[PDB]
Design brief:
- The structure is cut from a larger assembly and holds three copies of chain A (about 525 residues).
- Chain A has about 525 residues and is an alpha/beta fold.
- Chain A has three domains: about 180 residues, Thiamin diphosphate (ThDP)-binding fold, Pyr/PP domains (Rossmann fold, 3-Layer(aba) Sandwich), CATH 3.40.50; about 160 residues, Rossmann fold; about 180 residues, Rossmann fold, CATH 3.40.50.970.
- Chain A is built from 21 helices and 20 strands.
- Chain A has a six-stranded parallel sheet.
- In chain A, β1, α2 and β2 form a beta-alpha-beta unit.
- In chain A, α1 packs parallel to α7 and α10 packs parallel to α13.
- Chain A is globular.
- At the A-B interface, α2, α4, α5, α18 and α19 of A face α2, α4, α5, α18 and α19 of B.
- β7 of chain A pairs parallel with β14 of chain C.
- The complex binds ligand TZD (3 copies), calcium ion (6 copies) and sodium ion (NA) (2 copies).
- Chains A, B, C: Its cofactor is Ca(2+); thiamine diphosphate; Mg(2+).
- Chains A, B, C: GO terms for molecular function: acetolactate synthase activity; benzoylformate decarboxylase activity; flavin adenine dinucleotide binding; magnesium ion binding; thiamine pyrophosphate binding.
- Chains A, B, C: It catalyses: phenylglyoxylate + H(+) = benzaldehyde + CO2.
- Chains A, B, C: Its EC number is 4.1.1.7.
Chain lengths: ~525, ~525, ~525
């Protein structure tokens, strides 16, 4: 068998059937004779390729396979890799290298010192020492991406390797099963459960690895048994809990002092599937107030090591959430009372307040919609106003890197063809990965893109306020016609300058058979 | 003085007055109180920021200063850095980091292991150990980018550093002058000159560092004195010689055997300012034929080390070209005869042959036009058909990385306001950095963008032919309306479906007062 | 509190009370005011410092703390770090850096790009961005070294940081408990147990992480219940099983074909706590024969990923071994029969055969002796001839790096003051870390060093035979007087030129109150 045949067999035997790519000449010997059971999803720029693959992997809860061109293609994707690293996204990033005979002379398209290029944003990065090693290196890449804590990995392959003979012993790779589905030993798990059972006023904080593990329902059972309020850890990349469940208390503020004040009076705080904590603004004070102790369950040793307070347990989130939910006692405390609905903000017949947009989306969207957020100044209102009952209903760029939501929304929609995806993206953020729209048009992936157009980088005006920073250039982005950009890439486009038009546009978009972009005129901050 | 005040003083004293950027919150404390003598050039995505800065630096022949946001912003720019590394572009890339007090907890927007992120595509990469060190680190960055061999450098700065007190000894940084303008010692230079004077049939090969050094005129004098044919080294990022001078012989084929056959019968081949050689296709054979010896002058030790043949001298290209041109004897051989004009290809009243496009551009463009090429399947025809008399008249992505020409053409036009810039870009390549168009509209930078629309990744069809690779996915890019994309970003747009319309569109574009995009319907390969 | 006071408090609260070091000026501000409850163990060269700390950590089963001088001190230790990486040794390596104010100018003793220096041989490598971050960075280092898979970590600290004020919130670091004591979820553990219970002819292979976890007794119970033969995985750094238990089958040959032939006919092979596999010689063939399937339990994702065959489970070895031993059925198969004793090799009254040395050590040493091996050509005979009943009885350089056993034997003896340590070291290997002898003399650590003196690098003669490599320089090491070297460093020394003298020397050494070196004249290969 050839290295080409052996590698595609390994991929299919490991459950991979889709290649997200932007091709180049170092990759043509891999992509030739493309197998009939695989599909190739083309995107026009590599940040878009990786963003699409990332949304697909996060929604599918399985690894996604990417093929990029050498150093330039890899490099164009590295902002997308920064988000994937923070979201623990299982991405297998492959890039083609020059033929082995010209690597030394650094022919055009040689990826020099290739394995160092995507570091430090990958769990594993490698170029094989021979063609016959390629399938074994691909096997390492698959398992490295997929083991807890999941994350992106990188493999560089010289183009001449594909046609070489494979090692006949490579067949032992095909059906390897690797598990990291582990939980704390019985004795120490019993100690933890007793501490939870004994707590007088517990609180629960959930992060994105809960939603990645589909541990959401087990966390609902846990919160109901402990009769405990539940918050989502700050800077949330996913939604790990039903947002109208009576225990839900919302998104935590991303500040040290704000979090310790919120948790004051809670004697035990159990954090599951989150870093402790992804603070953002610098809000110095106590990490925890006297009387509060913290216990973190994380799938990532790096998170356990860097927490500034608390105990930690490094284990699989799915296995731990299931075990805790089934072992804790039902507390005799009263179940927390649901938060009140948000107030309606006053809205005239002009430009839309973001609150009006989210209320209207909540009114009109299906109950199993999936939302993506890259509307950076409106995140708090979004979390208050969208009822997200189901797992996999929310994505936000995990490293704060713009250019995620537009392509990721296409990958999520590909992963979840029966759930309507609605990406809410600011006019600034929309530009970073604008060409991803073409992939939605070409493959008819029916994502709805809602562009919140207020003419400015609004969140940067906010942070400038926090810092008291004046005379800052580069904050305004006037003069972008998003309906023309959508037309440019073949996507149907609508404009909403007021509430009547927003409702009409959403009705049309929800009825459409393909992707739709709605440009919404929102109020300037 | 503050670190902020001291750093801007260092920048202005070192000749820097422009910041190319896309802002974020870690950068607001740097950008606040922006000095009135500086300008800020915003672009909407970081590949575009860096591409604009790169064209500006290459055309200006001086360092350009960039400010990006943390890891995601840096990462979005790394494909652009791969081109800048190959073109020896003096780019000072700065990125904002989290405040020092939250780096350890890895708050959102922390750039983890920052200096490793852009490696291996930078000459120097650093994060200072204290705020007071920031001006000295910026001084290192400026000089590292600017010394031969020039190249990109990276500096990560925690946002809290800017408001701290500077070291009063930082003033010694302001006026430092660092020179690498060096040439081979007299005795060995005399040996070289004698070898050139004695050669019976010399040839000259020039690369991009000739144009970077503005050594073009000295190379013309050298070729005239030696009565030697002149070729441009393969995969050329710049044009180092007048293309209708009688000695000019064109762009070398990027293959080992093709180059040794071309040079057969030349006893001494002098390569100046090029890697030896930037081959592309694998065309195995002799590096040089018997009877040919090679001497390379390069500004880059890495190039001298990796050449597979020949002697090398590591020195400044400007200083060496001037010394050789002034020291060699005038040979009594006859001056080479100019190459014949290219033939006119048959053109009907339908879609345009690329040859027709280049002939028409050559007919209509000013004699001091500047061209950029990202029309990958038409490069040979472009080099045959455009008369480029002057230095700084041609740019092509030095690492082969798509997404360079569109933004770089805006930076070149900013650097050269009195020379009309004409970027010739394929329909595939146009998407990688499409949002750069907005910067041309906003700042009214009057670049002309000629989109060669043939619906496919044509060069990848070509390389597939070379490899004999069939059943390759992802090679077609139908369904892009470039006039709508231009409208989206505020740029006037024209379409040319035939020759009459191409001439009319070019006449309108050349008369316009702002940037213009022309979508040209070209023949499918 | 100062950073100095806070850091020592963190160390003592995390169970660290010993610093293994070789001092320098960047470290004096850390070592000053050394706390009265800590001890400092000086060694004269850094390979020795790290080797001593490594033996101490491996025998104690807890992290060891090291302090080295800048880049040169770190660099002198990097061969020792290569062994520590392979043995999963929990080592916290700290190195002093220049004061922050002169790092930029690269004053003498600046460790440039410090975190990159020990890569790729560390799990985590870091230099803090401010003095107040130092305790939190030390906390990260402690937990990173200690979490599964354990391994070395590196922290570089500018010398001026120690006297700065600590963050008052650093107290939350002191009592953090971090656990990785996890095992496979119940459902999948039940599937594994059923596969073991159903196997017709199981085999067990154990590696060093069994001994690190003190899982040895649980593995004995497991082997007795399954009535299965037990081998030690190749290139063994530790002994995970009693070597005269009836199930024991010895050290596996370090070859692909040799291992698959050994395992032929075993239907399920369970590997616990080993890479699959640490082959050495290239012995190509089948990874496993038809009819054999493999299941690996490893604490290290990198091991699970790179195995060329089998299923894998990534979990704590102690937790998994205990669970399996307690859950499997008692098989009705007959218990394996013990291997026969080794034969006595013919020995005349001259130089000693290594077999005679090991037989005599086995006869005379206490039953709870601990052996270290760096006698590279005699490893197979050592494993056949020493009855090692107890855990923690054997250490061998895990990366094959010479210079481990001599210093590690001193650290093991410090960790286990009531178990006599006997290091068996070749005359070649003894030189790499010879100065470690001084630490044994100074602190009166009563290790016995047995130098096998045959005048040559015997194993390299063996491998030369395998390769059929002739005319190789540098294989002989004549002219070393090991009694004089021992005298040089203050250690009592004896010579044994024949068996009578070997017995007399061992009797004297075993009766001594301090360290003793015995130079044994062994037969030339
Ligand atoms: C790759 C990249 N570049 C720049 C930024 C900085 N950035 C930027 C540019 C923001 C403004 C986004 O504007 P928007 O129009 O999408 O939304 P708002 O107006 O609601 O802020 S928020 C933010 O952190 C970033 N996070 N990522
Ligand atoms: C960042 C990046 N991604 C992908 C490629 C691969 N690539 C691609 C995608 C080419 C096709 C360009 O198509 P075009 O329309 O711009 O021009 P032609 O039709 O004349 O080839 S040529 C080439 O090397 C690349 N060089 N750089
Ligand atoms: C740091 C280092 N350098 C060199 C070697 C190579 N090496 C060497 C030099 C060996 C010979 C050891 O000789 P010895 O006297 O200790 O024992 P034998 O005579 O029994 O081989 S075995 C081996 O792998 C090594 N493993 N580690
Ligand atoms: Ca099919
Ligand atoms: Ca906005
Ligand atoms: Ca001004
Ligand atoms: Ca094209
Ligand atoms: Ca004491
Ligand atoms: Ca020896
Ligand atoms: Na990198
Ligand atoms: Na290193």
């Amino acid at each position: 068998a050839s290295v080409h045949g052996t590698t595609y067999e390994l991929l299919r035997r490991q459950g991979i059937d889709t290649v997200f790519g932007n091709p180049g000449s170092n990759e043509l010997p891999f992509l030739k004779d493309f197998p009939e059971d695989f599909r190739y999803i083309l995107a026009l720029q590599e940040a878009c390729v990786v963003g699409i693959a990332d949304g697909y992997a996060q929604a599918s809860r399985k690894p996604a396979f990417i093929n990029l061109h050498s150093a330039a293609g890899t490099g164009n994707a590295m902002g997308a890799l920064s988000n994937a690293w923070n979201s623990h996204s299982p991405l297998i990033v492959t890039a083609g290298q020059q033929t082995r005979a010209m690597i030394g002379v650094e022919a055009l398209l040689t990826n020099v010192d290739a394995a160092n290029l995507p570091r430090p944003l990958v769990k594993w990065s490698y170029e094989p020492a021979s063609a016959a090693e390629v399938p074994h290196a691909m096997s390492r890449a698959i398992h490295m991406a997929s083991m807890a804590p999941q994350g992106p990995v990188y493999l560089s392959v010289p183009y001449d390797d594909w046609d070489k003979d494979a090692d006949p012993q490579s067949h032992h790779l095909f059906d390897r099963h690797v598990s990291s589905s582990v939980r704390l030993n019985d004795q120490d798990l019993d100690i933890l459960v007793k501490a939870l059972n004994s707590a007088s006023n517990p609180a629960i904080v959930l992060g994105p690895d809960v939603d990645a593990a589909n541990a959401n329902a087990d966390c609902v059972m846990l919160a109901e048994r402990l009769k405990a309020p539940v918050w989502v850890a700050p800077s949330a990349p996913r939604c790990p809990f039903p947002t109208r469940h009576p225990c839900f208390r919302g998104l935590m503020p991303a500040g040290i002092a704000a979090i310790s004040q919120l948790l004051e009076g809670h004697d035990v705080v159990l954090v599951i599937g989150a870093p402790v904590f992804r603070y953002h603004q610098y809000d110095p004070g106590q990490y925890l107030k006297p009387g509060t102790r913290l216990i973190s369950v994380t799938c990532d040793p790096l998170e356990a090591a860097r927490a500034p307070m608390g105990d930690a347990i490094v284990a699989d989130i799915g296995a731990m959430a299931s075990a805790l939910a089934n072992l804790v006692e039902e507390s005799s405390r009263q179940l927390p009372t649901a938060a009140p609905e948000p107030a309606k903000v006053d809205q005239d017949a002009g430009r839309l307040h973001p609150e009006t947009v989210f209320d209207t989306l909540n009114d009109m969207a299906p109950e199993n919609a999936i939302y993506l957020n890259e509307s950076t100044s409106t995140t708090a209102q979004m979390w208050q106003r969208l009822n997200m009952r189901n797992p996999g209903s929310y994505y936000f760029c995990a490293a704060g890197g713009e250019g995620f939501a537009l392509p990721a929304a296409i990958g999520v929609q590909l992963a979840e063809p029966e759930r309507q995806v609605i990406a809410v993206i600011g006019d600034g953020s929309a530009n970073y990965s604008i060409s991803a729209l073409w992939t939605a048009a070409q493959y008819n992936i029916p994502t709805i893109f809602v562009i919140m157009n207020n003419g400015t980088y609004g969140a940067l005006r906010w942070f400038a306020g926090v810092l008291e920073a004046e005379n800052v250039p580069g904050l305004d982005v006037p003069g972008i016609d998003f309906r023309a950009l959508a037309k440019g890439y073949g996507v149907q486009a609508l404009k909403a300058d007021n509430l009547e038009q927003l409702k009409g546009s959403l009705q049309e978009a929800l009825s459409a058979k393909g992707p739709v972009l709605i440009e919404v005129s929102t109020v300037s901050p």
